[PDB]
Amino acid sequence: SGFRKMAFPSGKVEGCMVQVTCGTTTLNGLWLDDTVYCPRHVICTAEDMLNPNYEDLLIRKSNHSFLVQAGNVQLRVIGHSMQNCLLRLKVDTSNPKTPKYKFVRIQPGQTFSVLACYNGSPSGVYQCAMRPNHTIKGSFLNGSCGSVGFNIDYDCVSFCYMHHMELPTGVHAGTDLEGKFYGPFVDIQTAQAAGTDTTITLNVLAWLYAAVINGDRWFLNRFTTTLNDFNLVAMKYNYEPLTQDHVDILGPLSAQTGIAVLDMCAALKELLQNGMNGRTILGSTILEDEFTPFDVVRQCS
Amino acid sequence: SGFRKMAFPSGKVEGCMVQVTCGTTTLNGLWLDDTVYCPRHVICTAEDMLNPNYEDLLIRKSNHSFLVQAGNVQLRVIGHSMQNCLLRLKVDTSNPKTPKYKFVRIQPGQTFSVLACYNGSPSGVYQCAMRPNHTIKGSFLNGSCGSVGFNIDYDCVSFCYMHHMELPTGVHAGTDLEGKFYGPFVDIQTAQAAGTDTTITLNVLAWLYAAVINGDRWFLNRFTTTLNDFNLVAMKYNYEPLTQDHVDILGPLSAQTGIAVLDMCAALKELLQNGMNGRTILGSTILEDEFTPFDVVRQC
């Protein structure tokens, strides 16, 4: 029992982190096989960031403009190229610690673990869910750029995120490992406005199943609702529309607890309409949206 | 910016985890150097757990009673003994991955990372605090016993927790790495239950300090308080009494921010009496108590 925001164990990742310096800028890189991946803004000075032209900035660099340090050992860069918003550096050593891996592009509402890193050194690990608006609510300090986000399936690390930017409102923006930004954002230090973050509805439902699977059932009720009537309410509370696909996904949790998905939706509609009245669910006073159904099943069994 | 509850990276720990089986019971063990540490209850059947004499149960066992597996390599037990509530199994191979380490007994309110493990293989990692009532609010499932709690400083892992039991409220109990239970709990399946818990006042205050460090001052006020007057209020709200020792512990944060500790206490007292007004602090609608002053300084 119990339910916690749990990260994946970080050891496979920890062995891929390196430091990348270009001039006066140091940030993290990911060393897999014979390639190191890092934010392309490593090539920018702080002034540069105001209005960078990356292609211009890049040709003015050579393989040795880049110093890559793994632990002590310094790796010799023998190639460099730009893929979208990432720099790829070929190095002269293959990483002995490279895990089975893949690169994935995550869908909003999905979750992943982040290994916060400073100067190529791992500092902490936490779980965050990509927001609907494609931001994440992270803890990044200066020098955290290039820190990565991942999921682990069996022995295979699926890398999904690399940290690039902090938004004026304090939220964080980044790319997939092909260097394409999640969201509208760009690697320029200018005001860029986040969308409006809609609460994940599927996750909140999954959490309610977790709560039940953990014996917190006060919120349940005799009622049912149609999907349409649910949405008509949820959408007043800035909740994402619920779809049959979402309802289908919840089926296993529905089966495990015996509470029908639409019945849970009826509970939620009430919680939304009437608040929690000083009660808590799984210890929260708030409806939690950062757990996926998979997260609930992984954790709750 | 941002503030999140963060666990220590787990790789140094992941290297030490093994699976220990005795009879039909399988649980996790920690392999450091030539020794494997695990809950002594690995030796007890379900019916044993109701009323066990551990010394009686243990003499009945031999070294080969215990199967230790590191990944797919079987270790060979060449010795065994019991230390408080742990079994120490001597094995014929030393763990090549042993990190620098130590064993620490944590104090109530202090925090640590937990690597949840099943069948010797690490499943997840999370951050948690030792509650004033001596339990942890973990996420553990059957087979999680022997999973460990640790802090990392530099390259040294300090182990402070090993998982033993789940209590009726769904909270968890365990021992230090010498095998001594935190709290009044025992490794017997009895009616024992967690005591009433309290909020960790020291931690909430540290967290308020984090909030100002991170640029937020909304909850601050023009007032001050005596410690006693603070305790008088906070206690009504089920807060742990604040000690002078706690006030000193907060000294570095107080200096960093220019906010005297008792001035922060005044802020907290108002928050308690008035509530948060729909507002949040560091993204939370509630007063968070699982960040120690050290954690705050770490992260900030």
Assign residue B128 the CATH number of its domain. 2.40.10.10
Alpha-carbon gap, residue A173 to B196, rounded angstroms: 42
Q: Are B173 and B134 in contact, with CB atoms under 8 Å apart?
A: yes
Domain encompassing residue B9? 1-14+100-197
If asked whether residues A41 and A138 sit together in one domain, one would say no
If asked whether residues B122 and B45 sit together in one domain, one would say no
Q: Which residues of A touch B15 (CB under 8 A)?
A: 11
If asked whether residues B77 and B147 sit together in one domain, one would say no
Distance from CA of B13 to the nearest CA of A (A): 9
Q: Which residues of A touch B141 (CB under 8 A)?
A: 1, 300-301
If asked whether residues A28 and A39 sit together in one domain, one would say yes
Nearest CA-CA partner of B195 in B222, B168, B177: B168
Alpha-carbon gap, residue B176 to A112, rounded angstroms: 31
Q: Which of A149, A176, A197 is a domain's end point?
A: A197
Alpha-carbon gap, residue A89 to A77, rounded angstroms: 6
Alpha-carbon gap, residue B174 to B108, rounded angstroms: 13
Distance from CA of B250 to the nearest CA of A (A): 23
3-class secondary-structure state, position B174: strand
Nearest CA-CA partner of A207 in A294, A277, A112: A294
Nearest CA-CA partner of B210 in B154, B252, B246, B271: B252
Q: Are B62 and B55 in contact, with CB atoms under 8 Å apart?
A: no
In sequence order, which residues have a C-beta less than 8 Å from that of residue B229 and are 6 or more positions away? none
Amino acid letter, A213: I
Encoding tokens for residue B84?
């408080």
Judge: B116–A6 Cβ closer than 8 Å, yes or no.
Answer: yes
Nearest CA-CA partner of A164 in A54, A72, A13: A54
Q: List residues of B whose CB lies inside 8 A of any A CB.
A: 1-12, 14-15, 115-116, 122-126, 128, 137-141, 166, 170-172, 283, 285-286, 299
Alpha-carbon gap, residue A90 to A68, rounded angstroms: 10
Beta strand ranges found along chain A (DSSP E): 17-22, 25-32, 35-39, 66-69, 74-75, 77-83, 86-91, 100-103, 111-118, 121-129, 148-153, 156-166, 172-175
Q: Are A99 and A157 in contact, with CB atoms under 8 Å apart?
A: yes
Judge: B139–A285 Cβ closer than 8 Å, yes or no.
Answer: no
Q: Which residues of A are catalytic?
A: 41, 145
Encoding tokens for residue A21?
């310096």
Q: What is the Cα B213 distance to its own chain's centre?
A: 26
Alpha-carbon gap, residue A95 to A162, rounded angstroms: 19
Q: Which of A79, A99, A119 is a domain's end point?
A: A99
Q: Can B134 be counted among the known catalytic residues?
A: no
Using CB atoms, pick whichever of A14, A126, A286 lies closest to residue B4.
A126
3-class secondary-structure state, position B161: strand
Using CB atoms, pick whichever of A11, A141, A215 lies closest to residue B11.
A11
3-class secondary-structure state, position B290: coil
Encoding tokens for residue A49?
């960031």
Beta strand ranges found along B92-216 (DSSP E): 100-103, 111-118, 121-129, 148-153, 156-166, 172-175
How do beta strands B172-175 and B156-166 pair? antiparallel
Alpha-carbon gap, residue B253 to B247, rounded angstroms: 10
- Main-chain phi, psi angles of A284, to 5 degrees: -80, 145
Cα of first residue to Cα of last residue in chain A, in angstroms, is: 9
Distance from CA of A1 to the nearest CA of B (A): 6
Rounded to the nearest 5 percent, the helix, strand and coil shares of chain B are 25, 30, 45
Q: Are A147 and A140 in contact, with CB atoms under 8 Å apart?
A: yes
Encoding tokens for residue A111?
């979750």
B270 exposure class (CB count in 10 Å sphere: 0-12, 13-18, 19+): middle
Provide the greatest CA pair distance for chain B: 69
CB atoms within 10 A of CB B125: 29
If asked whether residues A128 and A231 sit together in one domain, one would say no
Q: Name the active-site residue from B22, B85, B117, B145.
A: B145
Rounded to the nearest 5 percent, the helix, strand and coil shares of chain A are 25, 30, 45
CB atoms within 10 A of CB A192: 15
Alpha-carbon gap, residue A237 to A113, rounded angstroms: 28
Instruction: List b or e across A248-268, with b for residues whose CB sees 16 or more CB atoms inside 10 angstroms.
Output: ebbeebbeebebebbbbbbbb
Judge: A124–B170 Cβ closer than 8 Å, yes or no.
Answer: no
Encoding tokens for residue A147?
């820190």
If asked whether residues B292 and B202 sit together in one domain, one would say yes
Chain A's closest residue to B118, CA to CA, is A299
If asked whether residues A290 and A211 sit together in one domain, one would say yes
If asked whether residues B127 and B175 sit together in one domain, one would say yes
Write the CA distances from B300 to A124, B112, B201, B256, integer angstroms. 13, 17, 20, 11
The total number of structural domains that make up chain A: 3
Instruction: Report which secondary-structure segment, H or E, holds B75.
Output: strand B73-75
Q: What is the Cα A169 distance to its own chain's centre?
A: 18
Number of residues written out for chain A: 301
Write the CA distances from A202 to A22, A247, A293, integer angstroms. 43, 8, 8
How do beta strands A111-118 and A100-103 pair? unpaired
If asked whether residues B62 and B203 sit together in one domain, one would say no
In sequence order, which residues have a C-beta less than 8 Å from that of residue B4 and are 6 or more positions away? A126, A128, A137, A138, A139, B299
Encoding tokens for residue A26?
């140091």
Provide DSSP, A205-266: HHHHHHHHHTT--TT--S----HHHHHHHHGGGTBPPP-HHHHHHTHHHHHHHT--HHHHHH
Put the strands of the sheet holding B73-75 in their side by side order.
Answer: B73-75, B66-70, B17-22, B25-32, B35-39, B86-91, B77-83
Alpha-carbon gap, residue A211 to A282, rounded angstroms: 6
Judge: A5–B126 Cβ closer than 8 Å, yes or no.
Answer: yes
Judge: B5–A126 Cβ closer than 8 Å, yes or no.
Answer: yes
If asked whether residues A229 and A293 sit together in one domain, one would say yes
